[PDB]
Design a protein around this ligand. Structure first.
Ligand code: ZN
Lengths: 187, 189, 242, 566, 104
């Protein structure tokens, strides 16, 4: 937690202090997106490399762990530049200009690394529901509890918090929040 | 006048003209004191320009100051509100009172942009900090304007301390919405 | 008067009031004459110094005007004249467009006997020539194009008794932005319209009859208000259109 | 000795006295297009005159005929003329039909009606302009005070000297006068350096002027290495003089950084991959012969030995692995010696502006040259081409402003494409043995093939010639014969023919170092053109480039074989 | 800038045959009205001048179309194509309006 705070601070300073010529582009994009109810942000990697190479190196080697920190930095900046709060966690969308890797050149050497590739969509599935905020209650002592989940790959506790059974907990489906998931096939 | 709209709203360049028609303070680098060709202006008092002594404080109109700084014969002193301390005081005042506008001069945005463009060397504080503070103020003022737009009616509105550029960029929407509301109310009488 | 700065201030306030107002404001006859005379004299002045500097140069291959205390004054004369000419040009063209918009209304005003408004005061002489010529040209165009093939019952371009009134009049309830200057010069006690309010500076009072309400305008505040209820204050310089 | 290095200031004052005015424009600058040093010097002069509020006009001209036509239309109100990039070699008064007695309006010497300044670096000087004319004045840099000691005596004393001793002396002095001529032409200095000297004398030096000076000096690296090696230490000193301070706390969006960092003789390293930089380099190609399969195999073996995976060396420089980029210097130092490529390591100048990215001087000059080359009944056909070449000057001019970076990126892409095309043509030239080795010179005529429409521009043909000369210099064959390169244009049915001087190997010792090999193609071309009624066009500023009709090529060259001086 | 429009040189914005004959006549008298306005009491002010405020004393301009030498008050401009000028804004307003110059 003593490194995550500094990481979030670095991301927030990147969002708030990046300037080209005479306009804060990433500060203006957030405000323009909030007005039309777009809760997301698009960042070009070349700007991030230009601002500070250590920040880029941190992201390039641990994406699943670092990306949620940038996710919460964005929504911390948004609540400052929009509100003096029904704002969900924002989304980060990335743009890259690196070399494209063919599908058949992807192997065990490329695990847990960000890649860029091209192909043909052949099928699109239906939308499914994934939980983000879970309201939880115990079967015996019956007290309220909450859980927060990020989709960057969790289970209900295998215990009891305050005899109750091994892992007694049920989900209160009302007052729980969900998002949209889709599966695609490439070629 | 007629072309390119201009019927009932000012363009940003005309607002800049009005802003540059306002006085400012300078430190002359030349001495034009009369001995013991003259300016003879027709729209501005030339007494200060005729009687100039080096390394002393005088005040003239803004555009003459810009013309002089185009050469190496002037140095414009930025107003006292263009400081980090005085901007942080206004930011705090802006935060504490969420239902009134802070008291800033009616040309703060235009003057800030012009001074940043022309007289970059004259500022004492680093210019990037001031540029960030200006954006910080503008965002909060925009939030307050967005909240205040909800109270539109047919009778009258009061915008006590709104700036010139902020009024100009919002006039066509506000006037037309209230005009349509007034016609709808009048029809039913 | 007898102050060249106040002439420029008055011209600027007249231009600013002209652009944002719906009606056709009265013409400041004296101010325009003084400004045109000043421009005419000033142009002659710069021409005189320019000629004097040029003539001596060619006589005996003398040095040009020595750069110090020479170029900047004359450059300032030129740019100042350029700005003033632009301001007057914009004012004149805006009022000419407004004249174009309200030709029939002005004609009806001039033709009415019991009308205190007269074109000799509200319109300049050149504007009178413009109005007369443009009206005749437009009438010739419409008569040659369309109106000749029409029954004698309806052949008039101005008909106040038809299904739709053909004479357009200025919008007297347009919403405008105003700033409360207060007394034009001072002596706050002298002004009878000023009335004090609780723990505040004196404020003007106006009435909206259609809404039937009383609205107080405090000095130093910007308002969005109807144009009719504020005509007298603007005419007496108590308020300024922004 | 008209205007010495120290005297450069006073001439400026004259331009401030005669030309400056708030009611008239009386200064005209004629600048040689298709040249980078002249363009940078004109930019510096334009900024200087803009600061002091002097109205000016810049007119890019292509050839001597254009200058002669434009001089007549020029009025007498224009008191000052500045000829940048040309005019030193030829006699200006005879060329422009200038009568000294006609130009005297300020009777007294003669102050004269108009003043013409010449700012050129192509030696040898014309003795008439240096020693005999008063309307024409030149910005000399120290050639006359040392080299031309006896020439001044000969010229003045022959002018004044005009019973057997007279006949003897006049002949043995006209001998010296003709000995001064009949010499080849080279370049010994840069215009931007002289303009920077003027700036330092006046006192208006800053970072932008230093960047422009570096840009002007860098362009001479490929053709005249000696001048660059002479001028480099002073550039290093001026860079250290103008450093802002020590301990820069943080990088802010307004910082500017001019740093001396180690760079390499590689083509566009920071805007392409490492493999591409090694592939499209003149020096690497000369040292390894990449046009055939053996060179490519050797390059693959080198990359394998160095420890860089072939997949990683083909990635973009920004997205290349950080660990490899950090240790590139050690890897170069310890491996480059085996393959003879140890000469690729050097130091240069790198400029950075905020959160944008770093650019080196070499990449900047290649982008500018690419913008010059491509951008945007036969007399009209040539006129349109020359008009487009004039038009490209403003495209290259705009790229020097910090606001227009998209044009710089476009120039980088154009440079990459142009170098690819040059390589593709060069491999075809080298594989089919199109180069013919005659006794006096080596001939290469391109009559058939794709994309011959790129070689109608002199700069592209100079690119291909620089490729071929670099390839021949490192060849084990020891010779210094000049080369002739000819290219056909079907639309005009004309060959464009250029003569190119030989060059010593880049890494060779300084024992042979001297004033570089002199270009003798101008005198030979003039000698052949005068004697025969050949349909040739010698009108470019560079006297080594001519346009000859298709029918006359084969006989003309034969005459050149017997001409000599080559 | 006033002028007789189609009879004299026009900026090629409009073809002759689009307008009706009565419209062509109307345009002629309207242009004459503009002309005898411009000679009224407001001679010094150019009622057909530019309507953007002046805020730059010295500007850089580029020539679009080739032309000959043109005299201006106290000097001469030589309009060689593909050449750049650094001169006061007031001198070149007319030439920019007529398409012989670019930029401001
Ligand atoms: Zn429990």
């Amino acid at each position: 937690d003593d490194d995550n705070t500094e990481i979030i601070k670095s991301f927030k300073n990147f969002i708030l202090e990046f300037r080209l010529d005479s306009q804060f582009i990433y500060r203006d994009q957030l405000r323009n997106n909030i007005l039309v109810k777009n809760y997301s942000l698009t960042v070009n990697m070349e700007h991030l490399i230009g601002y500070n190479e250590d920040i880029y190196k941190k992201l390039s080697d641990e994406p699943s762990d670092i990306i949620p920190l940038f996710e919460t930095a964005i929504t911390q900046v948004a609540k400052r530049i929009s509100i003096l709060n029904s704002l969900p966690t924002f989304q980060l969308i990335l743009n890259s200009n690196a070399n494209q890797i063919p599908l058949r050149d992807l192997d065990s050497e490329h695990v847990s690394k960000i890649v860029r590739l091209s192909g043909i969509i052949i099928s699109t599935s239906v939308l499914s529901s994934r939980a983000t905020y879970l309201s939880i209650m115990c079967r015996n002592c019956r007290h309220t509890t909450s859980i927060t989940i990020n989709n960057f790959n969790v289970s209900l506790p295998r215990s009891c918090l305050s005899n109750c059974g091994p892992d007694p907990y049920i989900i209160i489906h009302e007052s729980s929040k969900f998002i949209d998931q889709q599966f695609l096939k490439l070629q | 006048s007629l072309p390119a709209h201009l019927q009932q709203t000012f363009s940003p360049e005309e607002i800049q003209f009005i802003v540059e028609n306002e006085p400012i303070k300078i430190f002359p680098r030349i001495t034009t004191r009369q001995k013991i060709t003259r300016w003879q202006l027709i729209t501005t008092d030339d007494k200060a320009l005729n009687n100039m002594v080096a390394m002393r404080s005088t005040e003239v109109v803004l555009w003459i100051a810009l013309l002089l700084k185009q050469q190496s014969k002037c140095s414009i002193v930025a107003p006292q509100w263009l400081t980090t301390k005085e901007l942080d005081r206004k930011i705090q005042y802006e935060k504490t009172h969420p239902d009134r506008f802070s008291e800033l001069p009616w040309n703060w945005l235009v003057l800030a942009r012009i001074l940043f463009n022309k007289a970059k060397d004259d500022f004492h504080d680093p210019i990037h900090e001031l540029r960030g503070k200006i954006q910080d103020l503008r965002e909060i003022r925009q939030i307050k304007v967005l909240k205040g737009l909800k109270y539109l009616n047919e009778s009258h509105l009061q915008l006590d301390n709104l700036s010139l550029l902020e009024i100009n960029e919002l006039r066509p929407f506000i006037t037309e919405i209230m005009d349509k509301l007034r016609e709808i109310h009048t029809a039913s009488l | 008067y007898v102050s060249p700065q106040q002439d420029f201030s008055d011209l600027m306030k007249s231009w600013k009031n002209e652009r944002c107002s719906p009606e056709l404001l009265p013409y400041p006859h004296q101010l325009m004459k003084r400004l045109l005379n000043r421009i005419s004299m000033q142009s002659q002045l710069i021409e005189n110094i320019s000629m004097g500097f040029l003539d001596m140069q060619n006589a005996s291959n003398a040095n040009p005007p020595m750069p110090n205390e020479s170029k900047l004054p004359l450059l300032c004369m030129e740019t100042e004249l350029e700005r003033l000419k632009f301001v007057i040009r914009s004012y004149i063209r805006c009022r000419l467009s407004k004249i174009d918009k309200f030709s029939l209304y002005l004609r009806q005003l001039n033709e009415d006997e019991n009308s205190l408004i007269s074109l000799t005061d509200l319109l300049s002489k050149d504007e009178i020539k413009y109005h007369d010529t443009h009206s005749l040209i437009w009438l010739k165009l419409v008569n040659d194009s369309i109106l000749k093939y029409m029954p004698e019952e309806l052949q008039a371009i101005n008909d106040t008794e038809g299904s739709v009134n053909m004479i357009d009049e200025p919008d007297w309830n347009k919403f405008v932005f105003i700033h409360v200057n207060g007394p034009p010069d001072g002596k706050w006690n002298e002004d009878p319209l000023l009335q004090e309010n609780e723990f505040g500076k004196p404020c003007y009072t106006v009435t909206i009859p259609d809404l039937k309400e009383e609205v107080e305008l405090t000095i130093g505040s910007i308002y969005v208000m109807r144009y009719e209820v504020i005509r007298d204050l603007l005419r007496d310089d108590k308020v300024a259109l922004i | 000795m008209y205007y010495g290095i120290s005297q450069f200031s006073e001439a400026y004052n004259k331009i401030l006295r005669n030309s400056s005015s708030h009611s008239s424009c009386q200064l005209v600058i004629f600048v040689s297009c298709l040249n980078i040093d002249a363009l940078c010097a004109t930019k510096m002069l334009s900024l200087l005159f803009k600061k002091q509020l002097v109205q000016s006009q810049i007119v890019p001209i292509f050839g001597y005929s254009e200058l002669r036509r434009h001089y007549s239309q020029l009025d007498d109100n224009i008191n000052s003329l500045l000829l940048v990039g040309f005019g030193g070699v030829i006699d200006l008064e005879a060329f422009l039909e200038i009568d000294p007695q006609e130009y005297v309006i300020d009777t007294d010497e003669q102050s004269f009606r108009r003043d013409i300044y010449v700012l050129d670096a192509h030696r040898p000087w014309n003795l008439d302009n240096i020693f005999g004319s008063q309307i024409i004045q030149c910005f000399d840099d120290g050639t006359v005070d040392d080299t031309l000691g006896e020439q001044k005596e000969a010229y003045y004393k022959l002018l004044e000297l005009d019973r057997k001793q007279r006949k003897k002396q006049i002949h043995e002095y006209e001998g010296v006068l003709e000995e001064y001529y009949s010499q080849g032409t080279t370049v010994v200095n840069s215009i931007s350096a002289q303009i920077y000297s003027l700036l330092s004398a006046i006192g208006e030096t800053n970072l932008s002027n230093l960047w422009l000076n570096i840009l002007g000096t860098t362009s001479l690296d490929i053709a005249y290495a000696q001048v660059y090696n002479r001028l480099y230490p002073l550039l290093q000193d001026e860079v250290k003089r103008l450093t802002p301070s020590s301990r820069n706390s943080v990088k802010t969006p307004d910082t500017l950084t001019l740093n001396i960092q180690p760079d390499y003789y590689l083509f566009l390293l920071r805007h392409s991959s490492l493999y591409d930089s090694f592939y499209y380099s003149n020096y690497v190609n000369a040292k390894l012969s990449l046009w055939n399969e053996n060179g490519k195999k050797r390059l693959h073996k080198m990359f394998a030995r160095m420890g860089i995976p072939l997949s990683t060396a083909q990635e973009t420089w920004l997205y290349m692995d950080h660990s490899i980029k950090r240790e590139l210097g050690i890897i170069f130092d310890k491996n480059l010696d085996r393959y003879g490529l140890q000469d690729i390591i050097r130091d240069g100048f790198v400029r950075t502006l905020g959160y944008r990215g770093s650019i080196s001087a070499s990449e900047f000059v290649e982008a500018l040259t690419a913008l010059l080359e491509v951008g945007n009944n036969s007399a009209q056909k040539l006129t349109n081409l020359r008009k487009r070449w004039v038009s490209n000057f403003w495209l290259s001019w705009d790229a020097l402003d910090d606001r227009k970076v998209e044009l710089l990126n476009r120039g980088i892409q154009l440079a990459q494409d142009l170098q690819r095309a040059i390589f593709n043509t060069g491999v075809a030239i080298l594989e089919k043995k199109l180069i013919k080795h005659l006794r006096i010179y080596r001939l290469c005529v391109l009559q058939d093939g794709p994309d011959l429409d790129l070689y109608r521009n002199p700069l592209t043909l100079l690119r291909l010639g620089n490729w071929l000369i670099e390839c021949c210099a490192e060849s084990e064959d020891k010779q210094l014969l000049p080369m002739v390169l000819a290219s056909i244009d079907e639309n005009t049915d004309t060959y464009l023919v250029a003569g190119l001087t030989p060059r010593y190997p880049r890494g060779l010792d300084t024992i042979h170092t001297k004033k570089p090999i002199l270009n003798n193609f101008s005198m030979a071309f003039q000698q052949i053109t005068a004697e025969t009624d050949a349909k040739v066009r010698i009108d470019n500023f560079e006297s080594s480039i001519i346009e000859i009709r298709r029918e006359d090529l084969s006989p003309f060259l034969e005459k050149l074989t017997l001409s000599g001086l080559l | 800038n006033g002028l007789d429009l189609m009879s004299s040189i026009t900026f090629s914005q409009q073809d002759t045959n689009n307008l009706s004959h009565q419209e062509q006549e109307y345009l002629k008298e309207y242009c004459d009205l503009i002309t005898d306005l411009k000679s009224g009491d407001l001679v010094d002010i150019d009622l057909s001048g530019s309507l953007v405020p002046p805020s730059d004393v010295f500007i850089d301009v580029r020539v679009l179309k080739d032309a000959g030498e043109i005299q201006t008050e106290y000097g001469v401009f030589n309009l060689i194509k593909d050449s750049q000028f650094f001169v006061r804004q007031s001198d070149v307003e007319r030439l920019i309006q007529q398409g012989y110059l670019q930029k401001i």
